[PDB]
Amino acid sequence: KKTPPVYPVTVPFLGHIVQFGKNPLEFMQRCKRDLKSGVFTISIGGQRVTIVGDPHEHSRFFSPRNEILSPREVYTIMTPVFGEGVAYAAPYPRMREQLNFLAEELTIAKFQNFVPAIQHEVRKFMAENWKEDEGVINLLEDCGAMIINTACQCLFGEDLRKRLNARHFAQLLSKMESSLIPAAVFMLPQSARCREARAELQKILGEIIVAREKESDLLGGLLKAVYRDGTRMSLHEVCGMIVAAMFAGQHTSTITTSWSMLHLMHPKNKKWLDKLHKEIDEFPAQLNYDNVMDEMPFAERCVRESIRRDPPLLMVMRMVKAEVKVGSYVVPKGDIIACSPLLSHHDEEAFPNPRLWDPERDEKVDGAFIGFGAGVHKCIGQKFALLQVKTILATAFREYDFQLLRDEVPDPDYHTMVVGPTLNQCLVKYTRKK
């Protein structure tokens, strides 16, 4: 009549903290089987963390509006990176405007100059960093830029990038994130050390609008935005949404792209690689949007299966404000309710052989895949990242072949906020192709 089962903890203060850390997948795979339930409640620090790990129930986590399931108090962490009154740090109704504000820029209105834009960008890095017909790549780090390069290129305006190069906008981002550290979702020089990089970027920004006025891109659209009460976003409000737009893209999509390339370059998986080829071969250098979008479905599957196997975002969380029932269990207001792409995508009814990479697999429980989340919190970056990644792939597997130094694919380093493949494992020997 109330609640789902709880897991053993040997010593309380710790809870499950290192048991999670070592391997969150193993740990969760264990708990689920051992607790004979897809829905179960673990504990961090005498804080209650009840996971939603049975796929059929995802509706229960992703469907309810923020009041009933509220994300803010979980993501409070980002407030300094995003700003104090933005995204979650903003109140929800006003936040919704921000999401649609952002959404009206990733609107497929502006996607028409993107493809030819990121493509050219992929080459510019390749011809300048991939120089020889014999190759070195730390693909994870090389995709890190190729991603942040093409994106800035796509969303940063000509007058914007000159001032703030792609190469070193990363530098600000990767000085903002360093603020964000482990073990904070359930519990300063850097507050400053990061505030500085944000106040920096911000003035770098407010100094561009003056040149904008006394005289269009993500920023362009963002300033032309007026709220419900006919307000316009303050300097530092807009500043954050750019940060947030770009933070969200950089790692996920880098990882997604790397994880992606890896499986395809692998000898294990090379009927796919040549199925990619039967797909992208008759396509020319001239990449138009119809090509990526209308005529790249197989390649899309790969990227999706990449994200399926190893979701870059292991957990997503709400603070249970009202109390919500899930299957036959009930989640008590005061609990943190979580839902995990990582665990869910390894349910075997949903995804048989879940560590196997099969682009041409389909979810056998409708809704299982939650890589881009679901319900009232569906990712708004999805079609864009999907378009970045697809085009990067096409361009690269275009004129090239790839080899992995290793006998099999890198291990998911679960030792970060946003999980991608291992760093020291991700080296790849490139050779040129015609």
Ligand X SMILES: CC(C)c1ccc(NC(=O)O[C@H](Cn2ccnc2)c2ccc(Cl)cc2)cc1
In the complex, the residues that contact ligand X under the rule CB under 6 A are 75, 77-78, 87, 98-99, 102, 241, 244, 248, 252, 313, 379, 381
Q: Shortest Cβ distance from residue 301 to ligand HEM (Å)?
A: 15
Distances (CA, A) of 250 to 77, 141, 301, 346: 18, 11, 21, 25
Of these partners, ligand HEM, ligand X, none, which one is at the site of residue 77 (CB under 5 to 8 Å by kind)? ligand X
Of these partners, ligand X, ligand HEM, none, which one is at the site of residue 152 (CB under 5 to 8 Å by kind)? none
Q: Can you tell me whether residue 186 is helix, strand or coil?
A: coil
Residue closest to ligand HEM (Cβ): 381
Dist. CA 240–CA 219, nearest whole Å: 11
By C-beta, is 130 or 391 nearer to ligand HEM?
391
Q: What share of the chain is helix, strand, coil (3-state, %, to 5)?
A: 50, 10, 35
Q: Which residues contact 139 (CB under 8 A, 6 or more apart)?
A: 258, 261, 262, 426, 427, 428
Q: Shortest Cβ distance from residue 232 to ligand HEM (Å)?
A: 20
By C-beta, is 248 or 296 nearer to ligand X?
248
Is 339 flagged in the annotation as binding? no
Cβ neighbours around 195 below 10 Å, total:
17
- The answer to whether 43 touches 27, Cβ cutoff 8 Å, is no
Dist. CA 161–CA 272, nearest whole Å: 37
Binding of ligand HEM by 106 (CB under 6 A): yes
Q: Shortest Cβ distance from residue 345 to ligand HEM (Å)?
A: 11
Q: How far apart are the first and last CA of the chain?
A: 67
Of these partners, ligand X, ligand HEM, none, which one is at the site of residue 241 (CB under 5 to 8 Å by kind)? ligand X
By C-beta, is 126 or 337 nearer to ligand X?
337
Q: Shortest Cβ distance from residue 106 to ligand HEM (Å)?
A: 6
- The answer to whether 391 touches 384, Cβ cutoff 8 Å, is no
Q: Shortest Cβ distance from residue 373 to ligand HEM (Å)?
A: 3
CA-CA-CA-CA dihedral for 290, 294, 295, 297, to nearest 10: 140
The only residue of 377, 391, 392, 412 in contact with ligand HEM, by rule CB under 6 A: 377
Q: Shortest Cβ distance from residue 201 to ligand HEM (Å)?
A: 18
Q: Per-residue string for binding with ligand HEM, 309-338, x by CB under 6 A?
A: ---xx--x----------------------
Q: Which residues contact 394 (CB under 8 A, 6 or more apart)?
A: 280, 283, 287, 292, 296, 299
Dist. CA 347–CA 162, nearest whole Å: 47
Q: Shortest Cβ distance from residue 281 to ligand HEM (Å)?
A: 26
Contacts to ligand HEM from residues 218-277, by CB under 6 A: 245, 248-249, 252-253, 256
Binding of ligand HEM by 307 (CB under 6 A): yes
By C-beta, is 119 or 252 nearer to ligand X?
252
Binding of ligand HEM by 152 (CB under 6 A): no
| CA nearest neighbour of 190 among 176, 201, 171 | 176
- 42 strand-pairing partners: 49
- Residues at the binding site for heme are 379
Residues forming contacts to ligand HEM in the complex (CB under 6 A) are 71, 99, 102, 106, 245, 248-249, 252-253, 256, 307, 312-313, 316, 371-373, 377, 379-381, 384-385
- Residues at the binding site are 379
